[PDB]
Design a protein around this ligand. Sequence first.
Ligand code: HEM
Ligand code: HEM
Ligand code: HEM
Ligand code: HEM
Ligand code: KSY
Ligand code: KSY
Ligand code: KSY
Ligand code: KSY
Ligand code: KSY
Ligand code: KSY
Ligand code: KSY
Ligand code: FE2
Ligand code: FE2
Lengths: 156, 156, 156, 156, 156, 156, 156
Amino acid sequence: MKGDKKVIQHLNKILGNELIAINQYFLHSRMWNDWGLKRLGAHEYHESIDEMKHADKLIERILFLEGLPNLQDLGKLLIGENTQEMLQCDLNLELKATKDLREAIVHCEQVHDYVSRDLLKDILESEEEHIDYLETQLGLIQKVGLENYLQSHMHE
Amino acid sequence: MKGDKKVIQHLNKILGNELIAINQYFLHSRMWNDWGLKRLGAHEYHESIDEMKHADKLIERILFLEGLPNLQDLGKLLIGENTQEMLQCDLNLELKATKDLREAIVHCEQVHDYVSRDLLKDILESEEEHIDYLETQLGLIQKVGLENYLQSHMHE
Amino acid sequence: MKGDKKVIQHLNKILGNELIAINQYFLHSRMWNDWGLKRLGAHEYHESIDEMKHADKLIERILFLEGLPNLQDLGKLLIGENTQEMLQCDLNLELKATKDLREAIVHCEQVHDYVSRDLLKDILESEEEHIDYLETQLGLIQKVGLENYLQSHMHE
Amino acid sequence: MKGDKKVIQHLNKILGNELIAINQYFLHSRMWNDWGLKRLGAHEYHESIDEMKHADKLIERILFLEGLPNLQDLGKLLIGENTQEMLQCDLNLELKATKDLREAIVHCEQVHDYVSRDLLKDILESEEEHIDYLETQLGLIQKVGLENYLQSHMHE
Amino acid sequence: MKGDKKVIQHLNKILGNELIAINQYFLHSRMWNDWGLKRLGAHEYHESIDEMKHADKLIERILFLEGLPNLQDLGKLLIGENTQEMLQCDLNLELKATKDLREAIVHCEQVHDYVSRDLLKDILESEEEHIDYLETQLGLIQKVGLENYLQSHMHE
Amino acid sequence: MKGDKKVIQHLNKILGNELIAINQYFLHSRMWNDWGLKRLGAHEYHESIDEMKHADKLIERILFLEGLPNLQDLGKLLIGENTQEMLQCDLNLELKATKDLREAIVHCEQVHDYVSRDLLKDILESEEEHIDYLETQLGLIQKVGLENYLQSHMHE
Amino acid sequence: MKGDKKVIQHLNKILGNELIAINQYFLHSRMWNDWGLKRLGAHEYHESIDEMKHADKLIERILFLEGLPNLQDLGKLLIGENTQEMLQCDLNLELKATKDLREAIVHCEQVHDYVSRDLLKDILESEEEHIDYLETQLGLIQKVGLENYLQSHMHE
Ligand code: HEM
Ligand code: HEM
Ligand code: HEM
Ligand code: HEM
Ligand SMILES: O=C1NC(=O)c2c(NCCCc3cccc(O)c3)cccc21
Ligand SMILES: O=C1NC(=O)c2c(NCCCc3cccc(O)c3)cccc21
Ligand SMILES: O=C1NC(=O)c2c(NCCCc3cccc(O)c3)cccc21
Ligand SMILES: O=C1NC(=O)c2c(NCCCc3cccc(O)c3)cccc21
Ligand SMILES: O=C1NC(=O)c2c(NCCCc3cccc(O)c3)cccc21
Ligand SMILES: O=C1NC(=O)c2c(NCCCc3cccc(O)c3)cccc21
Ligand SMILES: O=C1NC(=O)c2c(NCCCc3cccc(O)c3)cccc21
Ligand SMILES: [Fe+2]
Ligand SMILES: [Fe+2]
C-alpha cells in the first residue's frame, strides 16, 4: 500500500534511533555482566531486546508502505565508562528518541496515516517506560549511595 | 436501628480520620514507587487498602444506625518530602487517630453501644499495629543508617 | 520526566473528578446495600473501584511527569435521596467528567503528550460505558416501572 | 449440476427473505440490548444467526445448481419502535417467509428437485419454530402485562 | 466455677428470650413454607437455628458458673398472621432482646465477669445483624410493593 | 448519550461499507468453496465474519449515540468472475473503505468524539491488514504463476 | 584476562561480519514475509537470530580478554532484489565470513589462545551449515524451477 514519502522518512529515522539503541544497550548489558553487575546486565539485555522488537515492527511497516527500510546507516553509540555514565548515556539517547517519535506522530496525523501513528504511540509508551526506569536508577544512586546501588545490582 | 446521635458523630470523626489516611498513604505509596523504593511503596499501598476497609465498615455501621456518613469533609493530609518525613507524617496521623478512637470507645461504652465499641476496638488494634510498624521503621533508620534503610526497600 | 505544566493541571482536574466519583459511588453503593437493593449496591461498588483504579493511574502519571498529585481538594459530592435521584446524580457527575476529559485530551495532543492522551482516552472509554449503564437504568425505570426495577435489583 | 431455472428463482426469493430477516433481527437485537433488555437482545441475536445459517445453505445450493445467488437486492426491513411492535414486525416477516417457502416446495416437488425440497422443509421447520416463539411472547405480554414482560427480559 | 448470682439471673433472662425466639422463628419459617414463600421460610429457619446455637452457649455458661439453666418458663411468642406482621413480630422481639442484652452486659462489667460479657457481646452482634435484616425487609416491602416482595421470596 | 449528528452520518457510511463487504466476501467465499479452492474459501469466510463483527460494533456505537443504524441501504457488490478478479474486487472495495475511514476519523477528532475515533482506528487497522493480505496474494500469483497459486489454495 | 592484541582485532573483524549478517538476513527475512513467502521469511529470521547469538559470544569473549567490542562500524549490506539474488547475496557474505574465520583461527593457534580458537571453530561450523543451506536452495531453484521453488516457500 503506497505510503506517504515523508512518513516513510520519519519511520526510517525512528528505525535508525532504534538500531543505535539495540547496540548501545547490548554492549552496556555485556559490560555490566563482565563487571559482575548481573542485575543491571539482565535488565539492559531486556531493554535491548525490546528495541529489537520495535525495529522489527518499523521494518515491517515500512515494507508494507512500499518503502526501503534503512538498516545500513548506524548513528553514534553513546557508550559510558562506568555505571553512572552508562545510565546517563542511555537517558540521553532515549530523550532524543522520544523527541523524534513525537515529530513523526505529528506528521502521521497530518497525512491521516493513523495506523502508523498508533504504532509509534505504542513505541513511545515503551520509550517513556525506559526513561522512567533510567531516571529512577539515577535517583536511587543519590538516595542509597553508589556502592549500595551497585551492591544491589550484583545478583539477579 | 436508631443509633445514639453522639455515637454517630464519633463514627463520622473516625471515618474522617480514615479518609485522610487513605489518601495520605496512597500518595506516599506512589511517591515511593516513583522513587524506586518499591518495598516501601507496596507496604504503604497495603496500609492504604486497610484504611479503605475500615472506612467501609464505618460507613456501613453509620447507615445501619440511621446516620449520614460524611465523605465530603476531608481534613489536612500530612505529606512528607522524603522517606524520613513521610514516615513521621504517617506516625503523627496515627497518633491522632488512636486518641480519637479511644474517646469514641469511651462514649460507645457509656451509651451501651457495645457493637460499635467492638468495631472501634478492632480498628484500634489495626492502628496500633501500624504505629508499631512506623516506630520500628524510624528505629531501623537509626540502627542501619538511612542509605542502607532505603537500599533494603528498593526491591520487593 | 518534566511534563507540561498545563497537562499536569489537566490531569489534576481529572483526578479531582475521579476522587469525587470514588466517594459518591461508594456511598451510593452502601446506601443501596443498606436498603436491601444488593444488585445495585454491588454494581455501584464495582463502579467506585473502577474510579479508584483510574485515580491510581492518574497519580502515577502526574508523579512521573514531576508534578504534585492533588488528593487534598475534594469537590462537591452529588448524593441522592432515592434510587432515581442517585442514578441521575451519578449521570450528572459523569457528564461533567467527560467534558473535562475531552478538554484535557485536546491539550495533551497540542503539546504532543501522546501517552497522557492515551491514558485519558482509556479513562474516557470507561466513563462513556458508565454513562451507557446509567442512561439504560433510567430508561428501564420508565419501561418496567419503579417497583419492578427495584425488585430486579434486590438479589445479586 | 444444472438446476431448474424456476427452482433457482425460488431459492433466490427465499434467500432474499432471509437477508431481510438477518438485518431486521440483528437491529432489533441491538436495540433491545441498548435499552437494557438483554434477554430479548440475546434471543433475537440467536434468531439473526439462525437466518445467517439458512442464507449460507441457500447460497451453497444455488451455486451447486449453477445459479447466481442474489445478495445485492435487499427488501424492506420491518423495524419496530417498541418491544410490542418489534415482535409483531418479526411475526409479519415470518408469515410472509413461510408462504414463500410453501410455494417453493410445491415447485421443487413438481420438477423432482427433492434435495432442494428437503432443504426448504428444514428451513420451514425453523421458521415455524420462530413463529411459535413470537406468538408465545405476544401472548405472554397479555398474560403478565407489559411491565412484567419487560422486567423478565432485563437479565440473562 | 462459682458465678455471681445476678449474672446467672441475667443469663437465664437472655436464655429465656432466645427460647422464645427459637419457637417463634421456627413457626414463622414453617408458616412461610406452607404458604409457598420458600425463600422466607429458609431464611427464617436459619434464624431459628442461630438462636438455638446461642441458647446452647448460654446453657453451657450457666452450668459452668454452677447455676441452673431455666428451660421451663417459656414467655409469650409473637406470632404474625401475614408476612409484614411476622417480620414486625420478629423485630419487636429482637428489640426487647437487645435491651435485655445491654442490661446484662452492664452488670457483667460491674462484677468483672468479662467472659460472660464477651459471650453476650457476640450474641448482641448476631441480634443486631438480625435487626438489620428485618428492618431491610420491611423497607423493601415499602419500596418494591408487597406483591413484588412476596413474589421475590417464592423460590430459593 | 446525544452524539454529534455528523459523527453518526460517518458511522452509518462506514457501516454501509461494511455491509457491502460482508456480502461480497461471503459470496466470494462460497464461490471459491464451490470451485474446490477451499483455502481461499475459508480465508474469505473469516474476512466476512470480521466485517460482521465491525458492523456489530458500529451499530452498537450508533445506538449508544442515539442515532438510527442504517441496515437498509446496500451499495454495489463488486463480484469477480475468477480468482484474480475476485481478489482485485476485494482490494478495490477495501481502498474505498479506508478512504472513508480516514475522513470519518478526521471528523471525530474535530468534534472531540475520541471514543468513536478509537473504534474507527481499530477498524482501519483491520482493513489495512486485509489490504496487506490482498496485495500479497496478487503478488504471489505473479511470482508462482496462477496454476500453482490455485493449487496451493485447494486444501485447507 | 589480558588477551593478545591481534586476537582481539580478529575477533572484532569476525564480529563486524556477524553484524552485517544480522541486518542483511533480518531485512531479507522481512522482505520475504512481505511478499508472502513465509517459509523463506521464517528460515531467514532464524539465520539472523543465529548470527545474533554468535555476535553475543564474540562480544563476551572480547570483553573477557579486556578489549573493546566494536559495534559501531557496520560494513556494506548485500541486499538482493529478488529471491535468487537474495540467496546469492547471503552466500557471497558467508564465503567472505568463512575466509576471515579461518585466518583468525590460524592466529589463535599461533599464540596459543585455544579457547578463542574453539569459539571460532563452533562459529565456523554454523557458517558452513548456512553455506550448505544456501547452495542447496540455489540448486533446488534449478531442479524444480523458480515458480515451484517459491510456491514451496509460501506456507510455513
Ligand atoms: C548487535 C546486534 C544484535 C545483537 C547482539 C542481538 C542479539 C540478540 C539475542 C542474543 C537475541 C536472543 C536470541 C535467543 O536467545 O533466542 C535476540 C533476539 C531478537 N533479535 Fe536481536 N540482536 C541484534 C540486532 C538485532 C536487530 C538489528 C534486529 C531487528 C532489526 C533484531 C531482532 C531481534 C528479534 C525480533 C529477536 C527476538 C526477540 C523475541 O521475540 O524474543 N536483533 N537478539
Ligand atoms: C471513600 C474512600 C475509599 C473507600 C471507602 C475505598 C474502599 C475500597 C475497598 C473496600 C477496596 C477493596 C479492598 C479489598 O478488599 O481488596 C478498595 C480497593 C482499592 N482502592 Fe479504594 N477506597 C477509597 C479510596 C481510594 C482512593 C482515593 C484510591 C486511589 C487514589 C483508591 C485505590 C484503590 C485501589 C487501587 C484498590 C484496589 C483495586 C483492585 O485492583 O482491585 N481507593 N477500595
Ligand atoms: C431448647 C431449645 C432448643 C435448643 C437448645 C436447640 C438446639 C439445637 C442445636 C444446637 C442444633 C444444631 C445446630 C447446628 O449446629 O447446625 C439444632 C438443630 C435443629 N433444631 Fe433445635 N434446638 C431447640 C429447639 C428446637 C425446636 C423447638 C425445634 C423445632 C420445633 C428445633 C428444630 C431443629 C432442627 C430441625 C434442627 C436441624 C436438625 C438436623 O437436621 O440436623 N429445635 N437445635
Ligand atoms: C447486518 C449484517 C450482518 C451482521 C451484523 C452479522 C453479524 C454476525 C456476527 C456478530 C456473527 C458472530 C461472529 C463471531 O463472533 O464469531 C456472525 C456469524 C455468522 N454470520 Fe453474520 N452477520 C451479517 C450478515 C450475514 C450474512 C449476509 C451471512 C450469509 C449470507 C452471514 C453468515 C454468517 C455465518 C455463517 C455465521 C457463523 C454462525 C455460526 O455458525 O455460529 N452473516 N454474523
Ligand atoms: O539498508 C538497506 N535497506 C534496503 O532496502 C537496502 C538495499 N535495497 C536495494 C533494493 C532492494 C529491494 C527490491 C525490491 C523490494 C525491496 O523491499 C527491496 C540495498 C542496500 C542497503 C539497504
Ligand atoms: O458525605 C455525605 N454523606 C451524605 O449522606 C451526604 C449528603 N446526603 C444527602 C442525602 C441524605 C439522605 C436523604 C434522605 C434519605 C437518605 O437515605 C439519605 C449530601 C452531600 C454529601 C453527603
Ligand atoms: O494532595 C497533596 N498532594 C501533594 O503532593 C501534597 C503535599 N506535598 C508536599 C510536598 C511533597 C514533595 C516535596 C518535595 C519533593 C517531592 O517529590 C514531593 C502537601 C499537602 C497535600 C498534598
Ligand atoms: O435500517 C434501518 N435502521 C433503522 O433504525 C430503521 C427503521 N427505524 C424505525 C424507527 C426505529 C425506532 C423508533 C423509536 C425508537 C427507537 O429507538 C427506534 C426503519 C426502517 C429501516 C431502518
Ligand atoms: O428448666 C430447668 N432447668 C433446671 O436446671 C431444672 C431442674 N433442675 C433440677 C436439678 C438439676 C441439676 C443441675 C445441675 C446439677 C445437679 O446435680 C442437678 C428441674 C426442673 C426444671 C429445670
Ligand atoms: O396453639 C396455640 N398456643 C397458644 O398459646 C395460641 C394462641 N394464643 C394467643 C395469645 C394472644 C395472641 C394473639 C395473637 C398473636 C399472639 O402472638 C398472641 C392463639 C392461637 C393458637 C395458639
Ligand atoms: O448478488 C450477486 N450475486 C452474484 O452472483 C452477483 C454478480 N455476479 C457476477 C458474475 C459472477 C460469475 C461470473 C462468471 C462465473 C461465475 O461462476 C460467477 C454481480 C453482482 C452482484 C451479484
Ligand atoms: Fe413483578
Ligand atoms: Fe506445482
